[PDB]
CSV table of C-alpha atoms and ligand atoms in Angstrom, one decimal:
chain,number,residue,atom,x,y,z
A,1,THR,CA,-25.2,69.0,78.8
A,2,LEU,CA,-23.5,71.7,80.9
A,3,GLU,CA,-19.7,70.9,81.9
A,4,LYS,CA,-19.7,70.5,85.6
A,5,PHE,CA,-17.5,72.3,88.1
A,6,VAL,CA,-16.4,75.2,85.8
A,7,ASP,CA,-17.7,78.2,87.7
A,8,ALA,CA,-16.7,79.4,91.3
A,9,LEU,CA,-19.5,79.3,93.8
A,10,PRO,CA,-20.8,82.9,94.2
A,11,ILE,CA,-21.0,83.9,97.8
A,12,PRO,CA,-23.8,86.5,98.0
A,13,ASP,CA,-22.9,90.0,99.5
A,14,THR,CA,-24.4,90.8,102.8
A,15,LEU,CA,-27.1,93.4,102.6
A,16,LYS,CA,-26.0,96.7,104.0
A,17,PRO,CA,-28.8,98.8,106.0
A,18,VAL,CA,-30.2,102.1,104.4
A,19,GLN,CA,-30.2,103.3,107.7
A,20,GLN,CA,-29.0,101.7,111.3
A,21,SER,CA,-29.2,103.0,114.8
A,22,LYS,CA,-29.2,101.1,118.2
A,23,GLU,CA,-33.0,101.1,118.2
A,24,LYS,CA,-33.6,100.4,114.6
A,25,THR,CA,-32.2,98.9,111.5
A,26,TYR,CA,-33.9,99.7,108.0
A,27,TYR,CA,-33.3,97.9,104.8
A,28,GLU,CA,-34.7,98.4,101.3
A,29,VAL,CA,-34.8,95.6,98.7
A,30,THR,CA,-36.2,96.0,95.2
A,31,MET,CA,-37.3,93.1,93.0
A,32,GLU,CA,-35.9,93.8,89.4
A,33,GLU,CA,-35.8,91.7,86.2
A,34,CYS,CA,-32.0,91.5,85.5
A,35,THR,CA,-29.7,89.1,83.5
A,36,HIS,CA,-27.0,86.9,84.9
A,37,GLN,CA,-24.8,84.0,83.5
A,38,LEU,CA,-25.7,80.8,85.2
A,39,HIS,CA,-22.7,78.9,83.5
A,40,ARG,CA,-19.5,79.6,81.8
A,41,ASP,CA,-21.0,78.3,78.6
A,42,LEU,CA,-24.3,80.1,78.5
A,43,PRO,CA,-25.6,83.5,77.3
A,44,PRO,CA,-27.0,85.6,80.3
A,45,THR,CA,-30.3,84.4,81.9
A,46,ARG,CA,-33.2,86.9,82.3
A,47,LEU,CA,-34.3,86.4,85.9
A,48,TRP,CA,-36.2,88.0,88.9
A,49,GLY,CA,-34.0,89.2,91.7
A,50,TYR,CA,-34.0,90.8,94.9
A,51,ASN,CA,-32.0,94.0,94.2
A,52,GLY,CA,-31.5,92.3,90.7
A,53,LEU,CA,-29.4,89.4,92.3
A,54,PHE,CA,-29.8,85.7,92.1
A,55,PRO,CA,-30.0,84.6,94.8
A,56,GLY,CA,-30.8,87.7,96.7
A,57,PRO,CA,-28.4,89.5,99.0
A,58,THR,CA,-28.1,87.7,102.4
A,59,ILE,CA,-29.4,89.5,105.3
A,60,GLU,CA,-27.4,89.0,108.7
A,61,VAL,CA,-29.3,90.2,111.8
A,62,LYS,CA,-28.6,89.5,115.5
A,63,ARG,CA,-31.2,87.9,117.8
A,64,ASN,CA,-33.6,90.8,119.0
A,65,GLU,CA,-32.2,93.3,116.4
A,66,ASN,CA,-35.2,95.3,115.5
A,67,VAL,CA,-35.3,94.9,111.7
A,68,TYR,CA,-37.5,96.7,109.2
A,69,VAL,CA,-37.4,95.9,105.5
A,70,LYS,CA,-39.1,97.4,102.8
A,71,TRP,CA,-39.8,95.0,99.8
A,72,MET,CA,-40.7,96.8,96.6
A,73,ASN,CA,-41.8,95.5,93.3
A,74,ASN,CA,-40.2,97.0,90.4
A,75,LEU,CA,-40.6,94.3,88.0
A,76,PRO,CA,-42.0,94.2,84.5
A,77,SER,CA,-45.9,94.3,84.3
A,78,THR,CA,-45.9,90.7,82.6
A,79,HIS,CA,-44.5,87.6,83.7
A,80,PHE,CA,-42.0,85.6,81.6
A,81,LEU,CA,-43.1,82.3,82.9
A,82,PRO,CA,-46.4,80.5,82.0
A,83,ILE,CA,-49.3,81.5,84.2
A,84,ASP,CA,-52.2,79.1,84.6
A,85,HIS,CA,-55.4,81.4,85.0
A,86,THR,CA,-57.8,78.4,85.8
A,87,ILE,CA,-56.3,77.6,89.4
A,88,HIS,CA,-57.5,81.0,91.0
A,89,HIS,CA,-60.6,82.8,90.3
A,90,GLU,CA,-59.5,93.4,87.8
A,91,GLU,CA,-56.2,92.1,89.2
A,92,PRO,CA,-52.5,92.6,87.8
A,93,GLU,CA,-50.8,89.8,86.2
A,94,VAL,CA,-47.7,90.2,88.2
A,95,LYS,CA,-48.3,90.0,92.1
A,96,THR,CA,-45.4,89.9,94.8
A,97,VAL,CA,-45.1,89.4,98.3
A,98,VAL,CA,-41.9,88.4,100.3
A,99,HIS,CA,-42.2,85.7,103.1
A,100,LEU,CA,-39.4,85.4,105.7
A,101,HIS,CA,-39.5,81.7,106.2
A,102,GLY,CA,-38.9,80.6,109.7
A,103,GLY,CA,-39.5,84.3,110.7
A,104,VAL,CA,-41.3,84.9,114.0
A,105,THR,CA,-43.1,88.1,112.9
A,106,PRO,CA,-46.4,90.0,113.3
A,107,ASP,CA,-48.9,88.6,110.8
A,108,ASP,CA,-49.0,91.8,108.4
A,109,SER,CA,-45.4,91.4,108.1
A,110,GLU,CA,-45.3,87.5,107.4
A,111,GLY,CA,-45.8,87.7,103.6
A,112,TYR,CA,-49.5,86.3,103.7
A,113,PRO,CA,-50.2,85.1,100.0
A,114,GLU,CA,-53.3,87.6,99.8
A,115,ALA,CA,-51.0,90.5,101.1
A,116,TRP,CA,-49.5,90.8,97.7
A,117,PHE,CA,-48.7,93.9,95.8
A,118,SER,CA,-47.9,95.0,91.9
A,119,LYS,CA,-45.3,97.2,90.9
A,120,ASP,CA,-44.8,100.4,93.3
A,121,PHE,CA,-47.9,99.1,95.4
A,122,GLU,CA,-50.3,100.3,92.8
A,123,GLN,CA,-52.7,97.4,93.7
A,124,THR,CA,-52.6,95.5,96.8
A,125,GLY,CA,-54.2,92.1,97.7
A,126,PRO,CA,-57.1,91.9,100.4
A,127,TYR,CA,-54.8,91.1,103.3
A,128,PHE,CA,-52.1,94.0,102.4
A,129,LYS,CA,-51.6,96.3,105.4
A,130,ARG,CA,-47.9,97.7,105.1
A,131,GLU,CA,-45.2,98.5,102.6
A,132,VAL,CA,-42.4,98.3,105.2
A,133,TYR,CA,-42.3,94.6,107.1
A,134,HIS,CA,-41.1,94.6,110.5
A,135,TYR,CA,-38.8,91.6,111.8
A,136,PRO,CA,-38.2,91.9,115.5
A,137,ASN,CA,-36.3,88.6,115.3
A,138,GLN,CA,-37.2,87.7,118.9
A,139,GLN,CA,-36.3,83.9,118.3
A,140,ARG,CA,-33.3,81.4,118.1
A,141,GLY,CA,-30.2,82.0,116.2
A,142,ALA,CA,-31.0,80.0,112.9
A,143,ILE,CA,-30.9,79.8,109.0
A,144,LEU,CA,-33.9,81.5,107.5
A,145,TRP,CA,-34.6,82.4,104.1
A,146,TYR,CA,-36.9,84.6,102.1
A,147,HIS,CA,-38.9,84.1,99.2
A,148,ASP,CA,-41.9,85.1,97.0
A,149,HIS,CA,-45.1,83.9,98.6
A,150,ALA,CA,-48.0,85.4,96.1
A,151,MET,CA,-51.4,83.8,95.7
A,152,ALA,CA,-51.4,81.1,93.1
A,153,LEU,CA,-48.0,82.5,91.6
A,154,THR,CA,-45.4,81.0,94.1
A,155,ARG,CA,-44.0,78.3,92.1
A,156,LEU,CA,-43.4,80.8,89.3
A,157,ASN,CA,-41.9,83.9,91.3
A,158,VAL,CA,-39.8,81.4,93.2
A,159,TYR,CA,-38.6,79.7,90.0
A,160,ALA,CA,-37.9,83.1,88.6
A,161,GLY,CA,-35.3,83.8,91.1
A,162,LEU,CA,-36.8,85.4,94.1
A,163,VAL,CA,-35.0,83.5,96.9
A,164,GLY,CA,-32.3,84.7,99.4
A,165,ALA,CA,-30.9,83.9,102.7
A,166,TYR,CA,-31.4,85.4,106.3
A,167,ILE,CA,-29.3,84.5,109.1
A,168,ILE,CA,-30.2,85.1,112.7
A,169,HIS,CA,-26.8,85.4,115.0
A,170,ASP,CA,-27.4,84.8,118.7
A,171,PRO,CA,-24.3,86.3,120.7
A,172,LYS,CA,-24.8,83.5,123.2
A,173,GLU,CA,-23.8,80.8,120.6
A,174,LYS,CA,-20.6,82.7,120.0
A,175,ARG,CA,-18.8,81.1,122.9
A,176,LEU,CA,-19.2,77.9,120.9
A,177,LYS,CA,-16.3,78.9,118.4
A,178,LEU,CA,-18.2,77.4,115.3
A,179,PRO,CA,-16.5,78.4,112.1
A,180,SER,CA,-17.5,81.9,111.1
A,181,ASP,CA,-17.1,84.9,108.8
A,182,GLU,CA,-15.4,83.5,105.7
A,183,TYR,CA,-15.7,80.1,106.7
A,184,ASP,CA,-19.5,80.3,107.1
A,185,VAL,CA,-20.9,80.0,103.7
A,186,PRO,CA,-24.6,79.8,102.7
A,187,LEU,CA,-25.5,76.9,100.1
A,188,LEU,CA,-28.7,77.9,98.5
A,189,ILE,CA,-29.7,74.9,96.2
A,190,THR,CA,-32.0,75.5,93.2
A,191,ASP,CA,-32.8,73.1,90.4
A,192,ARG,CA,-33.5,74.6,87.0
A,193,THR,CA,-33.9,73.6,83.4
A,194,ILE,CA,-32.2,76.0,81.0
A,195,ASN,CA,-32.7,76.4,77.2
A,196,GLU,CA,-29.9,76.5,74.7
A,197,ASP,CA,-30.4,80.3,74.6
A,198,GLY,CA,-29.8,80.8,78.3
A,199,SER,CA,-33.6,81.3,79.2
A,200,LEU,CA,-35.1,79.6,82.0
A,201,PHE,CA,-37.7,76.8,80.9
A,202,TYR,CA,-40.6,76.2,83.1
A,203,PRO,CA,-43.3,73.6,81.6
A,204,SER,CA,-46.5,75.4,80.1
A,205,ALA,CA,-48.3,72.0,80.5
A,206,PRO,CA,-47.6,68.3,82.0
A,207,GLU,CA,-45.8,66.1,79.4
A,208,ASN,CA,-48.8,64.7,77.5
A,209,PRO,CA,-51.0,66.8,77.5
A,210,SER,CA,-54.7,65.8,77.5
A,211,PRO,CA,-56.5,68.1,75.1
A,212,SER,CA,-58.9,68.6,78.1
A,213,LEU,CA,-56.1,70.7,79.8
A,214,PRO,CA,-55.9,74.4,79.6
A,215,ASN,CA,-53.0,76.4,78.2
A,216,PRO,CA,-51.0,77.1,80.1
A,217,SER,CA,-51.6,74.3,82.6
A,218,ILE,CA,-50.1,73.9,86.2
A,219,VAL,CA,-48.0,70.7,86.6
A,220,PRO,CA,-48.0,68.7,89.8
A,221,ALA,CA,-44.3,68.6,90.2
A,222,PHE,CA,-41.3,70.3,88.6
A,223,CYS,CA,-37.9,68.5,88.4
A,224,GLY,CA,-35.0,70.6,86.9
A,225,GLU,CA,-32.4,69.1,84.5
A,226,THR,CA,-29.7,71.1,86.1
A,227,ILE,CA,-28.5,72.0,89.8
A,228,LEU,CA,-27.3,75.2,90.9
A,229,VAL,CA,-26.0,76.4,94.0
A,230,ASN,CA,-26.0,80.2,94.7
A,231,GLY,CA,-27.0,80.8,91.2
A,232,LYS,CA,-24.5,78.8,89.4
A,233,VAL,CA,-24.8,75.7,87.6
A,234,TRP,CA,-22.8,73.0,89.3
A,235,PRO,CA,-20.1,75.3,90.8
A,236,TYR,CA,-16.9,74.6,92.5
A,237,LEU,CA,-15.9,76.0,96.1
A,238,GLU,CA,-12.2,76.4,96.8
A,239,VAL,CA,-11.9,75.6,100.2
A,240,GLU,CA,-8.8,75.8,103.0
A,241,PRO,CA,-8.0,72.7,104.5
A,242,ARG,CA,-9.8,73.2,108.0
A,243,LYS,CA,-13.5,73.3,109.3
A,244,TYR,CA,-16.2,75.4,107.3
A,245,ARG,CA,-19.9,75.8,108.4
A,246,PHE,CA,-22.3,75.6,105.6
A,247,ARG,CA,-26.0,76.8,105.8
A,248,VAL,CA,-27.7,74.5,103.4
A,249,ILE,CA,-31.1,75.6,102.2
A,250,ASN,CA,-33.4,73.8,99.9
A,251,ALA,CA,-35.0,76.8,97.7
A,252,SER,CA,-36.1,74.3,95.0
A,253,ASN,CA,-39.8,74.1,93.9
A,254,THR,CA,-40.3,70.4,94.2
A,255,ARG,CA,-36.9,68.5,94.3
A,256,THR,CA,-35.7,66.6,97.3
A,257,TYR,CA,-31.8,65.9,97.7
A,258,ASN,CA,-30.2,63.3,99.6
A,259,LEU,CA,-26.7,64.5,100.0
A,260,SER,CA,-23.4,62.7,100.7
A,261,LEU,CA,-19.5,63.5,100.0
A,262,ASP,CA,-18.2,61.4,97.2
A,263,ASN,CA,-14.9,60.8,99.3
A,264,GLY,CA,-16.9,59.1,102.2
A,265,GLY,CA,-16.3,62.0,104.3
A,266,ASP,CA,-18.8,63.0,107.3
A,267,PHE,CA,-21.0,66.2,107.8
A,268,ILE,CA,-21.4,67.3,111.4
A,269,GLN,CA,-24.9,68.7,111.7
A,270,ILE,CA,-25.2,71.1,114.3
A,271,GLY,CA,-28.6,72.7,113.4
A,272,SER,CA,-31.9,72.3,111.9
A,273,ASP,CA,-34.9,74.6,110.5
A,274,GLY,CA,-35.4,76.1,114.1
A,275,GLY,CA,-31.7,76.5,115.2
A,276,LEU,CA,-28.9,74.6,116.9
A,277,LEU,CA,-29.6,71.1,117.7
A,278,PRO,CA,-29.4,70.1,121.5
A,279,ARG,CA,-26.2,67.7,120.3
A,280,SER,CA,-24.2,67.6,117.2
A,281,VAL,CA,-24.9,64.5,114.9
A,282,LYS,CA,-22.3,62.9,112.7
A,283,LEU,CA,-23.9,61.9,109.4
A,284,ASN,CA,-23.1,60.3,106.2
A,285,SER,CA,-25.8,61.7,104.2
A,286,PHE,CA,-29.2,63.4,104.8
A,287,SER,CA,-32.6,64.0,103.0
A,288,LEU,CA,-33.3,67.8,102.4
A,289,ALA,CA,-36.7,68.5,101.1
A,290,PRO,CA,-38.0,71.9,99.9
A,291,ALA,CA,-37.5,74.5,102.5
A,292,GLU,CA,-35.5,72.5,105.0
A,293,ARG,CA,-32.2,74.0,106.5
A,294,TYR,CA,-29.3,72.1,107.6
A,295,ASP,CA,-26.7,73.8,109.4
A,296,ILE,CA,-23.4,71.6,109.0
A,297,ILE,CA,-19.8,71.6,109.7
A,298,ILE,CA,-17.6,69.8,107.1
A,299,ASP,CA,-13.9,69.2,108.1
A,300,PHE,CA,-11.7,69.6,105.3
A,301,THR,CA,-8.3,69.4,107.4
A,302,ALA,CA,-7.5,65.9,106.3
A,303,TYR,CA,-8.6,66.4,102.7
A,304,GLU,CA,-5.9,69.0,101.3
A,305,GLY,CA,-5.4,68.8,97.4
A,306,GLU,CA,-8.7,66.7,96.9
A,307,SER,CA,-11.8,67.7,94.7
A,308,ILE,CA,-14.8,66.4,96.6
A,309,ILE,CA,-18.2,66.2,95.0
A,310,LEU,CA,-21.4,67.1,97.0
A,311,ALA,CA,-23.3,64.2,95.6
A,312,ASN,CA,-27.2,63.5,95.3
A,313,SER,CA,-28.8,60.1,95.4
A,314,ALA,CA,-32.7,61.2,95.6
A,315,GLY,CA,-34.5,60.7,92.3
A,316,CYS,CA,-36.8,63.5,91.0
A,317,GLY,CA,-39.3,61.9,88.5
A,318,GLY,CA,-37.0,59.0,87.8
A,319,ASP,CA,-33.5,57.8,89.3
A,320,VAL,CA,-30.7,60.4,89.6
A,321,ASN,CA,-28.5,60.8,86.3
A,322,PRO,CA,-24.7,60.3,87.3
A,323,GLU,CA,-23.9,62.9,84.7
A,324,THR,CA,-26.2,65.6,85.7
A,325,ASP,CA,-28.5,65.8,89.0
A,326,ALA,CA,-26.5,63.1,90.9
A,327,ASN,CA,-24.0,66.2,91.2
A,328,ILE,CA,-24.7,69.4,93.4
A,329,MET,CA,-21.3,71.1,93.4
A,330,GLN,CA,-17.5,70.4,94.1
A,331,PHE,CA,-15.1,71.5,96.9
A,332,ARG,CA,-11.6,71.7,95.9
A,333,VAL,CA,-9.4,71.7,99.1
A,334,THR,CA,-6.6,73.9,97.6
A,335,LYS,CA,-7.0,77.5,99.2
A,336,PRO,CA,-4.0,78.2,101.2
A,337,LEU,CA,-4.8,78.8,105.1
A,338,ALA,CA,-5.3,82.4,105.9
A,339,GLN,CA,-5.0,81.6,109.5
A,340,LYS,CA,-4.9,79.0,112.1
A,341,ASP,CA,-8.3,77.2,112.4
A,342,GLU,CA,-9.5,78.4,115.6
A,343,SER,CA,-12.9,77.0,115.1
A,344,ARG,CA,-14.5,74.1,117.0
A,345,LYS,CA,-17.1,71.3,116.5
A,346,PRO,CA,-18.5,71.0,119.9
A,347,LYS,CA,-20.9,68.1,120.9
A,348,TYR,CA,-22.9,70.0,123.4
A,349,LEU,CA,-24.7,72.8,121.5
A,350,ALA,CA,-28.0,74.0,123.0
A,351,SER,CA,-30.8,73.1,125.4
A,352,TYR,CA,-32.9,70.1,124.5
A,353,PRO,CA,-36.7,71.2,123.5
A,354,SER,CA,-37.7,68.3,125.7
A,355,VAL,CA,-36.7,70.4,128.8
A,356,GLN,CA,-40.4,72.1,128.2
A,357,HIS,CA,-43.2,70.5,129.7
A,358,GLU,CA,-46.2,72.2,128.0
A,359,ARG,CA,-49.7,71.0,128.4
A,360,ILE,CA,-51.4,69.5,125.3
A,361,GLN,CA,-54.4,72.0,124.8
A,362,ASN,CA,-55.4,70.1,121.7
A,363,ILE,CA,-54.9,67.2,119.2
A,364,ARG,CA,-55.4,68.1,115.8
A,365,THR,CA,-55.9,65.4,112.9
A,366,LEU,CA,-55.1,66.3,109.6
A,367,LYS,CA,-55.1,64.5,106.5
A,368,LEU,CA,-53.3,65.0,103.2
A,369,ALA,CA,-55.7,64.4,100.4
A,370,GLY,CA,-57.2,65.8,97.1
A,371,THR,CA,-59.4,65.3,94.1
A,372,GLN,CA,-59.6,65.9,90.4
A,373,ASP,CA,-60.7,69.0,88.7
A,374,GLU,CA,-63.2,69.6,85.6
A,375,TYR,CA,-59.9,69.2,83.5
A,376,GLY,CA,-58.6,65.9,84.7
A,377,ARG,CA,-55.9,67.3,86.7
A,378,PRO,CA,-55.0,66.3,90.3
A,379,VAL,CA,-55.7,69.0,93.0
A,380,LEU,CA,-54.2,68.5,96.4
A,381,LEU,CA,-56.1,69.5,99.4
A,382,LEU,CA,-55.2,69.7,103.4
A,383,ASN,CA,-58.5,68.1,104.7
A,384,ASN,CA,-60.2,68.2,101.4
A,385,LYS,CA,-60.5,71.9,101.9
A,386,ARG,CA,-59.6,74.8,99.5
A,387,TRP,CA,-57.7,77.7,100.6
A,388,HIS,CA,-60.6,79.8,100.3
A,389,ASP,CA,-62.9,77.6,102.5
A,390,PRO,CA,-63.7,79.0,105.9
A,391,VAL,CA,-60.5,78.7,108.3
A,392,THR,CA,-60.3,75.5,110.5
A,393,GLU,CA,-56.9,75.5,111.9
A,394,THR,CA,-57.6,77.9,114.9
A,395,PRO,CA,-55.2,77.2,117.7
A,396,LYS,CA,-55.2,79.7,120.8
A,397,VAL,CA,-52.4,81.8,121.3
A,398,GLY,CA,-49.8,80.5,123.9
A,399,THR,CA,-51.2,77.0,123.8
A,400,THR,CA,-49.4,73.8,122.7
A,401,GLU,CA,-50.9,71.3,120.2
A,402,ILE,CA,-50.1,68.0,118.7
A,403,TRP,CA,-50.9,67.9,115.0
A,404,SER,CA,-51.3,64.4,113.7
A,405,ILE,CA,-50.9,64.4,110.0
A,406,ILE,CA,-52.2,61.4,107.9
A,407,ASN,CA,-50.6,60.8,104.6
A,408,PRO,CA,-52.3,58.2,102.6
A,409,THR,CA,-50.8,59.6,99.1
A,410,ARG,CA,-47.9,57.8,97.3
A,411,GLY,CA,-45.3,60.6,98.0
A,412,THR,CA,-43.7,62.6,100.8
A,413,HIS,CA,-44.9,66.0,101.4
A,414,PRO,CA,-42.8,68.8,103.3
A,415,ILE,CA,-45.2,70.2,105.5
A,416,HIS,CA,-44.5,73.6,106.7
A,417,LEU,CA,-46.3,75.9,109.5
A,418,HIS,CA,-45.7,79.6,109.5
A,419,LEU,CA,-44.5,81.6,112.3
A,420,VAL,CA,-43.5,78.6,114.9
A,421,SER,CA,-40.8,76.1,115.0
A,422,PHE,CA,-42.0,72.7,116.4
A,423,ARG,CA,-40.8,69.2,117.8
A,424,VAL,CA,-41.0,66.1,116.1
A,425,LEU,CA,-42.8,63.3,118.1
A,426,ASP,CA,-42.9,60.3,116.1
A,427,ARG,CA,-43.8,58.7,112.7
A,428,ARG,CA,-46.0,55.5,112.4
A,429,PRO,CA,-47.0,53.3,109.4
A,430,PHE,CA,-50.7,52.6,108.6
A,431,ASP,CA,-53.2,50.8,106.1
A,432,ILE,CA,-53.7,52.9,103.3
A,433,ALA,CA,-56.4,51.0,101.8
A,434,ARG,CA,-58.3,50.5,104.8
A,435,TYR,CA,-58.0,54.3,105.6
A,436,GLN,CA,-59.2,55.3,102.3
A,437,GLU,CA,-62.2,52.7,102.2
A,438,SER,CA,-63.5,53.6,105.7
A,439,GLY,CA,-61.5,56.4,107.2
A,440,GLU,CA,-60.5,54.4,109.9
A,441,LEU,CA,-56.8,54.5,111.3
A,442,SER,CA,-55.1,51.0,111.5
A,443,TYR,CA,-51.5,50.9,112.3
A,444,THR,CA,-49.3,48.5,110.8
A,445,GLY,CA,-46.2,49.0,113.1
A,446,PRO,CA,-45.1,50.6,116.4
A,447,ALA,CA,-44.3,54.5,116.5
A,448,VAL,CA,-40.7,55.5,115.4
A,449,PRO,CA,-39.4,58.5,117.4
A,450,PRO,CA,-37.4,61.0,115.5
A,451,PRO,CA,-33.5,60.5,114.7
A,452,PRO,CA,-31.1,63.0,116.4
A,453,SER,CA,-31.5,65.2,113.4
A,454,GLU,CA,-34.8,65.8,114.2
A,455,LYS,CA,-34.6,66.2,118.1
A,456,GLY,CA,-34.3,70.0,117.9
A,457,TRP,CA,-36.7,72.5,116.3
A,458,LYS,CA,-38.2,72.0,112.9
A,459,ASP,CA,-40.6,74.4,110.7
A,460,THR,CA,-40.6,72.0,107.7
A,461,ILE,CA,-41.3,68.4,108.3
A,462,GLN,CA,-41.2,65.5,105.7
A,463,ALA,CA,-44.6,63.4,106.1
A,464,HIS,CA,-43.7,60.1,104.2
A,465,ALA,CA,-46.5,58.3,102.5
A,466,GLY,CA,-48.3,55.6,104.4
A,467,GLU,CA,-47.6,57.3,107.6
A,468,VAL,CA,-49.0,59.2,110.4
A,469,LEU,CA,-46.4,62.2,111.5
A,470,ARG,CA,-46.9,63.6,114.7
A,471,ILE,CA,-45.6,67.1,115.8
A,472,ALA,CA,-46.1,69.2,118.8
A,473,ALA,CA,-46.1,73.2,118.4
A,474,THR,CA,-46.7,76.2,120.6
A,475,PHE,CA,-48.6,78.8,118.9
A,476,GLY,CA,-47.1,82.1,119.8
A,477,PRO,CA,-46.0,84.5,120.7
A,478,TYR,CA,-48.2,86.4,118.2
A,479,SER,CA,-51.8,85.9,117.4
A,480,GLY,CA,-53.1,86.4,114.0
A,481,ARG,CA,-53.7,85.0,110.5
A,482,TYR,CA,-50.8,82.7,109.2
A,483,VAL,CA,-50.7,79.7,107.1
A,484,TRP,CA,-49.6,76.0,107.0
A,485,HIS,CA,-49.1,74.1,103.6
A,486,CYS,CA,-47.0,71.8,101.7
A,487,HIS,CA,-43.7,73.5,100.5
A,488,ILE,CA,-43.6,71.6,97.0
A,489,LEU,CA,-44.6,74.8,95.2
A,490,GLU,CA,-46.5,73.0,92.7
A,491,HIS,CA,-48.7,71.7,95.3
A,492,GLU,CA,-48.9,74.6,97.4
A,493,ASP,CA,-50.3,76.5,94.3
A,494,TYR,CA,-53.1,74.0,93.6
A,495,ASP,CA,-54.3,74.0,96.3
A,496,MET,CA,-52.4,72.4,99.3
A,497,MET,CA,-52.4,75.4,101.6
A,498,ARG,CA,-54.7,76.6,104.2
A,499,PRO,CA,-55.1,79.6,106.5
A,500,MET,CA,-54.0,79.2,110.1
A,501,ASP,CA,-55.7,81.7,112.6
A,502,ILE,CA,-53.8,81.8,115.9
A,503,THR,CA,-56.8,83.3,118.1
A,504,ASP,CA,-56.9,85.4,121.4
A,505,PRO,CA,-59.0,84.4,124.2
B,601,PER,O1,-43.2,79.7,103.9
B,601,PER,O2,-43.5,79.1,102.4
B,602,CU,CU1,-41.0,78.9,102.7
B,603,CU,CU1,-42.9,79.9,106.0
B,604,CU,CU1,-47.3,68.3,98.5
B,605,CU,CU1,-45.6,79.6,103.2
């Protein structure tokens, strides 16, 4: 296996606009197949990248900056990863659409799975409206990220390399003096399995496989043998002995991480998916499911000279291997100080979401379920509905709902709602066997309110097995056609995703 900590951590460049004025900022980004070396000891890997880069260029915008991005497909007409044709029923093979995750966007710029387009917009999906997306960014400073969202192809196009970071800077937060500029670094974490020849491996069927399975066949979960950060396998980052801010993004298909420092050092969490937490939280470890973001400070001041491993204790299809997936990256506190550390780690960060007193318009009960297809494969379904079934989640614009999410399955699902961020109310254990037999919900314990890390704003939330998770969300400010889904991509694609219509009176 590949030797750990031999390649420096890439810092993706910040995308420069094609045009900028005070009224409008305009970007162009083209998807391209390119080759990049993922580790010192590998031949170059064929990848799909935004502007040919893996990860894509980081986009940085200010709150309320009026942004337009033309996302273009200039990819080959055939995929290099195995497509299963039985999960979705003349269309081009390679379909793409870019979703700004966490973006508060009008619906035709949200990256709807059926708003896909093929090379040069030659063919477009039934919900396609526009080539140039509009991102008004009228929302909290936060770590967002952008990735492919094409119908039935999300797991594949994302795995191929179509991910990048998008940061919203709110200038009212500058007074906090959080580490910034060179000392503010994204960490996009993707697990990959890589063949001896340097080519990406993605399974063309489950391990067995039953001879009843089609070929290729979707798999219910993907666990990579190798961890990459910012497009390099187990990299190292030389840091100065001072405070850094890291924007940590789980851009993996299935894998959840549980991160800690191997020298016992602390993270200071200052932000979640939806932006700054009300109060900073000192943490020794944290769980990060697909699509979750953690905005953290790590203070290297006391650690000069040390090599510190960002470690992982969460299994994926088995226990972590100390030699491989137990490692994420390594910090090396050996970079000379460029200047005095003038940054801060404030306790008081932002308003509490609980300052809001919205009326509960509706209480929606949703269950995570599924069935088995004609081939014997598990099909995961929200409320035992298919993606293609008539829409049932129809919140009214401007109103607030509590969603009660019932999870009788054996694993955690990271549930994501497009458009909004939401509050976490609580989680509560229940009798699974009784719920499965009768559909009656019988609690086995009191409600557990969220920990401090979940007292701010979230857009992707871990719903553990045997629990009812309650969240509260205000559906706006736009009305239109959005989505909610599990963000384990292998679940999302078959078929754990549902439209969400935010309606006008
Ligand atoms: O958003 O996936
Ligand atoms: Cu996403
Ligand atoms: Cu999203
Ligand atoms: Cu799931
Ligand atoms: Cu989505």
